[model samples]
Target: SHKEFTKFCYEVYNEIKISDKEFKEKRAALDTLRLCLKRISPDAELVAFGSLESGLALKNSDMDLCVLMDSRVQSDTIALQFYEELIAEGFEGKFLQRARIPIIKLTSDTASFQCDIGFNNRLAIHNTLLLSSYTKLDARLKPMVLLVKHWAKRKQINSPYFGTLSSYGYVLMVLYYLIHVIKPPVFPNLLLSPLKQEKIVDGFDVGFDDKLEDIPPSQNYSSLGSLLHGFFRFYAYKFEPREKVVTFRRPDGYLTKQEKGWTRYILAIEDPFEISHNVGRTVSSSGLYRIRGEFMAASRLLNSRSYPIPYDSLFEEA
Candidate 1:
């Protein structure tokens, strides 16, 4: 039965994988945009981050990008100018200058891909690298993250603007389960490994040993089915939403929400490198209720024998 479930998950994964043609088109489009940005500012550099870089991308994932440029001009000015340049080049997107840092949300006519571009967010670049590194720690990590991300997307709980969690927030929850909550851990806490070397980027410590072999293999030999069951079961009944904050930066994977004066929040998850930001801040009280309910429902179905077509039951629109 575990073998059958594993085969089914693999089929789901293959369905979610970005097609080679799509990947190449997106890559060419990003390269063309990079060249265009460089024309305006030679020093400007563009990079893809998040799921795109983390190797867990779904077919329809947005191209998350960051444009880094060191300039005497303010970041807002550079962002505004770049926005105009893109529009002149016939790309449709908006630049909002009201945020602490300016950002552009664009849709590419060439590749038919949408992207979010932010200026000079060096912390985000490092955060992306951190998540990318974690995926390399073990073979199971990527599949588990991908499957859960797929589930979240299907459940319609992955959109942060809709009073729910973002993909990044959901990934953090999965990492918390793998690294801390599960016995014979699924992956080492890469953040806990001592920094034998160091670099300070944007006033934050962005250095960690990324050598893959350095992290010992997890003793947890559980199959994907068992691991998935544990993940849902843990979130459904084991995790205390109010008592602890979910995070991987610490060895034990938590810090009390009270310690951070985050008592008003029903869910708390620290951004790995962006220590001041709560990835869970966007979730409202009702959103938290809906998320927990889904977790419980999924866990129940997985544990029952009569829940025919379990995958469809767990993932179909609720």
Candidate 2:
């Protein structure tokens, strides 16, 4: 009875503490972005997602804003104007992509800290037929992502495992693998399902299109251990590879690793199920040093590594 009560109390306290913190930070960010947008565009609306929506923000999280344009103007114009207004407000950031799609970067009040502001055409944004197709896929992906996130949370791996890979870097790698690799072909539904359904299933005519292909594959296809290994090996290569930061060497990208071997490392421990008393690890004696280290390392890699897609370069031209 004592143990159960203790466990119950801890769970309740943990949820409340996390929820309160997330609510304040997310609302503060939303308020700031909303005020900034009104001053600039007056008609744009912001949608929150990722950490804010998922209840995963930490001490220094920035809010994510998706600026939705009013029906009369192109979202791209709103995207460009959003960047201009931030610069005018003395915030310096660049659009990460402007030619293919417009994505704005807005700096936080703090130097070198930023939030992504993205705009998508409302038609594309409201493409319900396509949305329905991926609903099942996203349902499957959510659990897998949560599994990794829960592992990170339990292991206190955020600071260490990520000392070499960023949350976003890990996000990218996880997403990349789902997109290009995994078998039975993992996520086969997205790739295999015809967009067009002739029989009017659920009162909608499904049309096959590339956009429907965007959802990450379901977890039902692979064992958790295999999924974990697939991810770990990819991460290991990120830090210990012969050729650094090459997209081709990436599991998803065009090229493949000819000589493949999994050398054992201490990182292979199963994610610990219980929290143990721990002293944090970091490059600096202070806050989020592990996150900082990974980001700096990754940034250096991005600069030195051969470019792919050239999204930032293309955005500069735009």
Candidate 3:
């Protein structure tokens, strides 16, 4: 029975993966961006990422990609203007996201891809740095990620198969488990120095160590049995009745009274059924609800009071 439920969750996840429109739209955006780059610089490289590349983008997921130019360019703005010109033609509305690592977002009726295209000076720098430092990081991480993306590409791939088991989902779960539950070396070296190193902590970092502290000291769940027990308990309670004031405060936990306040909303939330009918793997009637849940969850990870990162900007790093 439990296995059946697990299967059900996985199937739902997979179905949702297939229903995603971003997959196709994002792919189209990449092709266009690459074409535009090649017109000027033949040595340019186009890389796809974010939800589509990470296997987490939903049906309405925005296309996220990076266009990297070779160092042969004299100035950064030279690359910037070329990127701008690529989308300048016929793309009706063009805007740039104002951030440390700014990006261009473009939309047009004829434009098959509504994408958030990013420009990167160091295409392989992050990965290279990680491999050098965390030699013990999961060797399969890259391959597994690719496999998940490939699975997302299939038209016939069912949603349920991916709902609970998407590559990004698994990546988050693995990172969370290792940093919080497993302890000691918080993250694999490859991703660590760039993502979590406090000394070099910048806007585009992961800072996993900062997140692991979300668990309350009293409710410290270190081992798999303890962590799973706590996870299941909290997960079940997520759908429990709202009238009773419920809070997850374990003796060996990672939350505090103030920290519990953030999750207090979970107690107030009505059952998932009340929120919306189960969309069951595809982006259907309840798709918006799912989006709200995920977006809010991602934002919640930035809660400075309880989450691992001491500051909010850590999660927003490019």
Candidate with the greatest TM-score versus the true structure: 1
Who wins the lDDT comparison? Answer: 1
Off by over 4 Å in 2: 1-20, 49-59, 70-114, 118-169, 175-186, 189-192, 196-226, 233-318
Candidate 1 TM-score versus the reference: 0.93
Model 3 TM-score?
0.43
Shift of residue 192 alpha carbon in model 1, Å: 1.5
Ten-residue region with minimum lDDT total, candidate 3: 269-278
Candidate 1, 201-245: lDDT as tens digits: 777677767887656778988888778888889888988888889
Candidate 3 — which residues are off by over 4 angstroms?
19-25, 71-76, 95-100, 109-112, 121-174, 178-318
How much lDDT does each candidate structure score?
0.80, 0.44, 0.39
Residue-level error in angstroms, candidate 3, position 46: 2.1
lDDT of 3: 0.39
Model 3 per-residue lDDT tens digits across residues 1-318: 123323433444454443545556556666766777777777767676545554444455556556666545543454566556665645544545455455666665443546666666243233223322222333323332332333334422224343322333333333333334433423432223233444222233322223333323322323322233233333233322222222111212243323323232321211111111112222232332442343344334333245343322212221
The full ranking of all candidates by TM-score, starting with the best, is 1, 3, 2
Of 1 and 3, the candidate ranking higher by TM-score: 1
In the predicted model 1, the residue pairs found to clash are: none
